[PDB]
Structure formats: structure tokens, C-alpha cells
Amino acid sequence: SPILGYWKIKGLVQPTRLLLEYLEEKYEEHLYERDEGDGLEFPNLPYYIDGDVKLTQSMAIIRYIADKHNMLGGCPKERAEISMLEGAVLDIRYGVSRIAYSKDFETLKVDFLSKLPEMLKMFEDRLCHKTYLNGDHVTHPDFMLYDALDVVLYMDPMCLDAFPKLVCFKKRIEAIPQIDKYLKSSKYIAWPLQGWQATFGGGDHP
Amino acid sequence: SPILGYWKIKGLVQPTRLLLEYLEEKYEEHLYERDEGDGLEFPNLPYYIDGDVKLTQSMAIIRYIADKHNMLGGCPKERAEISMLEGAVLDIRYGVSRIAYSKDFETLKVDFLSKLPEMLKMFEDRLCHKTYLNGDHVTHPDFMLYDALDVVLYMDPMCLDAFPKLVCFKKRIEAIPQIDKYLKSSKYIAWPLQGWQATFGGGDHP
Numbered sequence: 001s002p003i004l005g006y007w008k009i010k011g012l013v014q015p016t017r018l019l020l021e022y023l024e025e026k027y028e029e030h031l032y033e034r035d036e037g038d039g040l041e042f043p044n045l046p047y048y049i050d051g052d053v054k055l056t057q058s059m060a061i062i063r064y065i066a067d068k069h070n071m072l073g074g075c076p077k078e079r080a081e082i083s084m085l086e087g088a089v090l091d092i093r094y095g096v097s098r099i100a101y102s103k104d105f106e107t108l109k110v111d112f113l114s115k116l117p118e119m120l121k122m123f124e125d126r127l128c129h130k131t132y133l134n135g136d137h138v139t140h141p142d143f144m145l146y147d148a149l150d151v152v153l154y155m156d157p158m159c160l161d162a163f164p165k166l167v168c169f170k171k172r173i174e175a176i177p178q179i180d181k182y183l184k185s186s187k188y189i190a191w192p193l194q195g196w197q198a199t200f201g202g203g204d205h206p
Numbered sequence: 207s208p209i210l211g212y213w214k215i216k217g218l219v220q221p222t223r224l225l226l227e228y229l230e231e232k233y234e235e236h237l238y239e240r241d242e243g244d245g246l247e248f249p250n251l252p253y254y255i256d257g258d259v260k261l262t263q264s265m266a267i268i269r270y271i272a273d274k275h276n277m278l279g280g281c282p283k284e285r286a287e288i289s290m291l292e293g294a295v296l297d298i299r300y301g302v303s304r305i306a307y308s309k310d311f312e313t314l315k316v317d318f319l320s321k322l323p324e325m326l327k328m329f330e331d332r333l334c335h336k337t338y339l340n341g342d343h344v345t346h347p348d349f350m351l352y353d354a355l356d357v358v359l360y361m362d363p364m365c366l367d368a369f370p371k372l373v374c375f376k377k378r379i380e381a382i383p384q385i386d387k388y389l390k391s392s393k394y395i396a397w398p399l400q401g402w403q404a405t406f407g408g409g410d411h412p
Contacts, residue, residue, distance in 0.1 A: 041332065042294045042328050043328070056293075057289065059289060059292075060290040060292070063285070063286065064283075067285055076273040076274045079269070079273055080269065086265075086266070087262075
């Protein structure tokens with residue numbers, strides 16, 4: 001049975017957890033707690049260990065899961081489209097993490113929220129003509145986008161008010177039966193968003 | 207003929223330029239200058255346009271180039287190994303870019319250089335038993351690592367003194383005949399490393 005190790009936070013691994021649940025894959029987690037500051041080629045968290053594949057790097061892990069289930073794309077062109085959406089989502093998600101620990105969070109937050117709409121608009125447009133980011137079926141960047149939306153909603157609860165197709169998208173991901181079940185389950189990690197020491201999305205509760 | 211658009215800087219695209227030269231691929235560049243602040247799904251620089259594939263996101267572009275030439279890996283496991291090295295190199299490269307524009311660069315530089323050795327050591331070890339990062343043949347993360355080494359050498363010319371296998375690796379990449387030729391050519395962009403407004407690796411010369 002595959003093992004996924006990470007902090008007991010959403011953080012970098014939450015989209016991977018959503019994907020695993022979507023696929024109904026069986027896995028156990030090694031969940032590291034706040035005080036728990038006390039082979040694998042590139043030691044880090046997260047790590048993914050299955051049947052003697054030992055992986056670090058969050059993107060390598062999610063892509064591996066996707067790949068194993070033939071979700072990365074059929075041809076070089078389709079694969080690049082997936083990697084493009086992937087990078088575009090990460091600009092949002094890292095955009096948050098990059099300031100979340102800063103003394104100046106509240107100030108930096110202004111500049112991030114200022115640029116967020118232009119970032120969201122590309123996904124908005126992508127979704128005017130498509131059910132999920134890559135058309136009719138779910139791909140891993142759908143879960144990365146879900147996680148990003150969930151996060152920026154804590155930062156600014158109105159950030160999606162100008163974006164109805166993103167709102168419906170996020171409800172749609174939540175309506176997927178495997179995902180609905182996971183979100184209501186005891187395995188779901190609601191909080192924190194970032195490491196507990198974060199100025200934003202840190203702490204033991206919202 | 208494929209078009210690669212980016213700033214006329216090393217920046218995010220330098221490893222892609224090295225890969226293209228390695229493959230002896232023919233391409234033209236759209237090079238945007240400092241004052242030149244005045245379809246494509248996710249508008250950005252860099253962009254890669256070939257035969258009606260219109261790509262943004264630097265990683266999507268390099269991976270696409272690799273993919274087209276069957277360099278991304280044979281099986282899900284090999285592909286994940288490549289994506290792992292990729293992410294590991296990016297921790298170094300983004301590590302630089304993340305502070306390069308900061309008022310506090312000189313201070314932040316201390317903490318980055320402090321953590322760099324532990325990051326370099328994993329590649330050092332990888333290279334005690336392998337010619338290139340993935341064994342006998344070159345893969346795209348080899349060029350990403352090359353670019354990262356070139357950059358941190360401007361930051362700290364002694365950072366590789368404890369790492370002989372990295373030193374020999376960087377000489378080895380340079381000895382590849384296509385790369386040696388490119389480095390001495392008129393297409394080679396030596397400087398700047400970051401956007402010209404950067405506190406580190408910016409400006410018109412070293």
C-alpha cells in the first residue's frame with residue numbers, strides 16, 4: 001500500500017490527496033505534527049513511497065500518480081497543455097505561500113490580490129467552453145486549481161464574485177461523489193493551509 | 207520554424223535554450239528588451255510557438271521540447287525521477303530569483319547560501335555514481351542544473367569548492383560540442399541573470 005508523508009496541513013500535498021481520493025486509490029499517510037521536528041534520493045516532505053518507487057518533490061509525486069493512471073496526456077501536445085495549466089495554477093498557489101510567512105504579509109497581500117483577478121480570468125475563460133480545465137474529464141490540475149481557490153477564498157472571500165464559472169467549478173469538484181465523501185470524512189485536513197507558523201493560513205484554526 | 211519568446215536575459219528560459227542547442231533544433235527567438243514593456247491560452251513570457259502549438263509556462267515549454275524528442279522517461283517511474291530532479295533544481299533556481307529583487311537581498315543571500323550546500327550535496331551524490339543526473343545520457347534537468355550552477359557561481363564563486371563532482375559536471379556540459387559552440391556564439395546571452403531591475407544578477411553587466 002502506497003505511503004504519502006507530509007505535515008498534517010493542506011500545504012503542497014492537498015491536491016495530491018484529492019487526486020488519490022478521486023481515483024479511489026488506497027494509501028496510508030505519515031502525518032507529521034507541529035512539534036515533530038524531531039532510498040529517498042532527495043530528502044524532503046512530501047514523500048511518496050510505493051512498491052519501491054521512493055519520491056520527493058510534490059509535483060513529481062502528483063504527476064507520478066496521474067501518470068500511473070494515464071492522466072498526463074496522450075501526445076506531447078496534450079501533455080504540455082496539462083503542464084501549462086499546472087504551472088498556471090502554481091503561480092496562484094506559490095503566490096500565496098511566497099508571502100504567507102512574511103512580516104509584511106498584510107502589505108504584500110494587497111499586491112497579490114490586486115494581480116489575482118488577471119490570473120483567475122484565464123481559468124474563467126478556459127471554463128466558459130469546458131467542464132473541467134482539460135475538457136470533459138478530470139485531470140490533476142483540476143485538483144490543484146480547487147486547492148488554490150479554497151486557499152484564496154480564505155484570503156479574500158469575495159475574490160470569486162466576478163468569476164461565476166470558477167464558483168460553479170469549485171462546487172462541481174465538491175459534487176464529485178468520491179470528493180464529497182472525502183471532504184466529509186475523518187481523513188480531511190481542513191486547517192492549516194500553510195505551515196502552522198504562517199502569518200496567513202497558519203495557526204490551529206481559521 | 208519554432209519561435210521562443212522571452213526577455214533578452216538568461217532568466218527562466220536559459221535551460222530551454224541549452225536544450226534546443228543540444229538537440230541542434232532550429233528555432234528563432236523573439237527577444238524583448240528592457241524598455242520594450244510596450245491563440246496563447248495563458249499570456250506570459252516565455253512563449254513557445256511551433257506548428258500551431260502555442261505554449262506559455264517555462265516548464266511546460268522545456269518539457270514539451272524534451273517530450274517531442276522522447277527524453278521525458280520511458281515508464282511512469284522514469285518520468286517521475288526526471289520530474290524529481292527538475293523540482294530539486296528549481297528549488298535552487300527559484301531560491302535565487304525569490305530574493306534577487308528584494309530590498310533585503312544582501313541579508314537574504316546569507317540564509318540562501320547557508321542552505322545551498324545541503325541542496326547541492328544531493329546532486330553531488332547523484333553524480334558520484336552517474337555521468338549526468340539521469341545516468342549516461344543527457345536529460346533536460348541537466349541543463350536546468352547547469353544554469354543553476356552558473357547563477358549561484360555569480361552569487362558565491364566558492365560555493366562549488368566543496369563539490370568536485372559538480373565542478374566536473376559543469377565542465378562536462380560545457381564540453382558537449384553543440385553547447386561549447388553555442389556558448390561561444392553570437393546567440394549566447396551572458397547577462398543579465400534575472401530581470402535588469404534585479405538587485406542581484408540584474409543590470410547590463412556583471
